[PDB]
Amino acid sequence: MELPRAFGLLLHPTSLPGPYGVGVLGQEARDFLRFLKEAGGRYWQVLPLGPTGYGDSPYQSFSAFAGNPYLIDLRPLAERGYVRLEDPGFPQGRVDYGLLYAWKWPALKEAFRGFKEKASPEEREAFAAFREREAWWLEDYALFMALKGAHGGLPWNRWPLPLRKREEKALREAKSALAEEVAFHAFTQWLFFRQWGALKAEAEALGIRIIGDMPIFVAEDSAEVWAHPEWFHLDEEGRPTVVAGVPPDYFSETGQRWGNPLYRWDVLEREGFSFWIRRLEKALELFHLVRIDHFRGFEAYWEIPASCPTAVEGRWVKAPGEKLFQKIQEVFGEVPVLAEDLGVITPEVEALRDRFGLPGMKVLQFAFDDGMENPFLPHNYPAHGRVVVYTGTHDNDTTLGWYRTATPHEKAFMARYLADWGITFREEEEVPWALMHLGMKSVARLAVYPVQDVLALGSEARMNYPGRPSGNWAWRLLPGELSPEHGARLRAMAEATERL
Numbered sequence: 001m002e003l004p005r006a007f008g009l010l011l012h013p014t015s016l017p018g019p020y021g022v023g024v025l026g027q028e029a030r031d032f033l034r035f036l037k038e039a040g041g042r043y044w045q046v047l048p049l050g051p052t053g054y055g056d057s058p059y060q061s062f063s064a065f066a067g068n069p070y071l072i073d074l075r076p077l078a079e080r081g082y083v084r085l086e087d088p089g090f091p092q093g094r095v096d097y098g099l100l101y102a103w104k105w106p107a108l109k110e111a112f113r114g115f116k117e118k119a120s121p122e123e124r125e126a127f128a129a130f131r132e133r134e135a136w137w138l139e140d141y142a143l144f145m146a147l148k149g150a151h152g153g154l155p156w157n158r159w160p161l162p163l164r165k166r167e168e169k170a171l172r173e174a175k176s177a178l179a180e181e182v183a184f185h186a187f188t189q190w191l192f193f194r195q196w197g198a199l200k201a202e203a204e205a206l207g208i209r210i211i212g213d214m215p216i217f218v219a220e221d222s223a224e225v226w227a228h229p230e231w232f233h234l235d236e237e238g239r240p241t242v243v244a245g246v247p248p249d250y251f252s253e254t255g256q257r258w259g260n261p262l263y264r265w266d267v268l269e270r271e272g273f274s275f276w277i278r279r280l281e282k283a284l285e286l287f288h289l290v291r292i293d294h295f296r297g298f299e300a301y302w303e304i305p306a307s308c309p310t311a312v313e314g315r316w317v318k319a320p321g322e323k324l325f326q327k328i329q330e331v332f333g334e335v336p337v338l339a340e341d342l343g344v345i346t347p348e349v350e351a352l353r354d355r356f357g358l359p360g361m362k363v364l365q366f367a368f369d370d371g372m373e374n375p376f377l378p379h380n381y382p383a384h385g386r387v388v389v390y391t392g393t394h395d396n397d398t399t400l401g402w403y404r405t406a407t408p409h410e411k412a413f414m415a416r417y418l419a420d421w422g423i424t425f426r427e428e429e430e431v432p433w434a435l436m437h438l439g440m441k442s443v444a445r446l447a448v449y450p451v452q453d454v455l456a457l458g459s460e461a462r463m464n465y466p467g468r469p470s471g472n473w474a475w476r477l478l479p480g481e482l483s484p485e486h487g488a489r490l491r492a493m494a495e496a497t498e499r500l
Contacts, residue, residue, distance in 0.1 A: 021090025
């Protein structure tokens with residue numbers, strides 16, 4: 001496609017500076033959008049914005065279409081006499097999903113009740129409208145959550161069979177009993193998409209394109225799976241017959257067992273890939289470009305026997321990527337998908353990605369563990385520039401925290417390379433800008449860099465650490481940490497490297 005040479009930033013809403021312990025679709029986002037713009041930024045990259053259960057990871061969401069309530073801006077509701085906002089005393093620059101979970105949610109069921117009372121037939125109708133429009137996915141979700149909650153936060157595939165196997169009466173009577181809890185989660189979803197819809201235009205106004213992200217494999221315990229057991233490899237108990245993951249390597253002798261459920265592509269294909277089409281449909285509604293973690297999963301996927309604790313007994317299975325994207329392109333005329341093809345990827349994948357002109361990924365933090373042959377090296381990127389360069393993604397340590405743990409060879413081989421590209425640094429705190437700058441000088445059309453580096457923060461500011469049992473997705477931004485200085489400094493490069 002056509003991704004005009006430019007630079008963007010990676011800042012998940014949660015990391016937005018804001019009162020009450022978390023980032024929200026509030027104006028501070030608009031401030032950032034103003035910052036981005038000022039700094040000459042044309043793109044903004046965020047992680048999946050779906051609801052999050054334990055772990056608080058945006059990739060193991062309860063819904064493939066639902067938005068994360070946490071990211072909702074509460075004050076605009078308190079500004080209409082809906083809910084009185086307290087504050088158990090949230091920490092600075094770090095999300096406390098424990099606190100937030102126990103506070104937000106309650107403070108939410110409050111705003112809702114504060115709505116049905118003081119709400120206006122303009123807000124009552126608007127909300128109702130959102131309900132008729134987003135029916136297909138919403139109904140299932142609101143019921144999924146309402147039930148999930150009613151059943152002591154238990155996975156759907158453990159609820160009484162009548163409900164698990166989604167029976168008529170069960171689903172009717174349950175809905176009737178929680179008619180209010182259903183109206184609630186919907187009300188949450190409404191507020192979310194509503195504010196994000198505006199936040200979108202705020203970005204569309206400030207000449208900005210937002211980049212969304214979505215995991216190829218859904219989450220086992222999610223509305224979608226529950227609602228549609230037919231599409232996933234699941235036994236009559238709901239539990240996945242097989243799970244997702246990757247094969248063993250020089251790193252993981254055992255491999256990886258993500259546990260995610262696998263798609264019955266045979267069925268999806270028969271149904272015209274209605275799940276994805278519907279899925280990308282929502283995507284294009286929220287963002288201008290959306291990425292798909294683990295892209296190779298479209299060419300072929302590693303099938304792991306649920307019963308196995310590891311990924312050893314796995315096997316490769318071919319998936320209809322060629323067909324899927326033919327449908328996507330015929331439905332949208334375009335295929336605005338950012339391919340997440342890091343890690344080892346076979347040519348059949350490369351062919352697919354390239355057959356639809358899908359931009360790939362390029363992370364610098366990996367470009368120095370070997371020789372100049374390193375694919376993550378600027379001089380090894382494709383000419384078409386249809387690739388995106390990241391100093392380091394969300395699943396990576398901050399570049400600073402990286403340079404502080406990188407092997408000696410890398411640290412040196414780097415400065416040795418940065419020089420070859422007219423780039424040189426002194427302090428280590430400057431290294432984040434070194435590679436950043438380097439990323440721009442590349443042929444790469446887009447150069448999205450995470451806010452953690454723009455500020456040059458240590459490992460402490462690391463977003464997610466694959467393997468670590470917590471503290472992930474916890475990092476946030478402090479008031480004014482993103483000063484004009486930083487902006488003008490980035491804009492400098494943007495112009496200097498003709499990205500503006």
